[PDB]
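Study this protein:
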Amino acid sequence: AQYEDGKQYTTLEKPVAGAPQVLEFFSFFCPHCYQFEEVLHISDNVKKKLPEGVKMTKYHVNFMGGDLGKDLTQAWAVAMALGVEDKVTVPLFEGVQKTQTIRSASDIRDVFINAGIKGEEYDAAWNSFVVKSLVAQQEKAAADVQLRGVPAMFVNGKYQLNPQGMDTSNMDVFVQQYADTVKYLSEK
């Protein structure tokens, strides 16, 4: 067939009940994640091809970058809680990987301030229980799939995208193949 289990995707032998429709995991420390997000724009191209009624979830992970890594999972919870993902994703990626100016939770906070989130509003969110449960959700979703590397995308808690089985000679073609595969898995 054109789409084959074990080729463009794999099937979880232990599927996850109640999982988000399209769930992507990343870390601001993850070099391929930087590519995916800043150069390939995977999330965005997946969106523009998803059917109607199918929503996207993106979670940060703890297992890269140690202590700052967990701070970033909590910052990403703040990002989701405030709905400012599209304002902090680029400066967080560049701050960690490009300029390497993010070394502490305070440096993470500066990114949000620079992006226009007021300090009081950031700190309130950071310390809130709504953010702690959002951190819990991220950790649980990763746990549910035994997540051990990023970037990763899962469709309906059943299928895992396998980009290694694709041509990377043209960046554009790879992205659309990736997106078309997510759409196919979504209409499964």
User: Anything to note?
Assistant: The chain is about 55% helix and 10% strand. The beta strands are 9-11, 22-26, 56-60, 152-155, 159-161. Residues 18 and 124 are 30 Å apart (CA to CA). Helices lie at 31-40, 42-49, 66-82, 85-98, 105-114, 119-126, 129-144, 171-186.
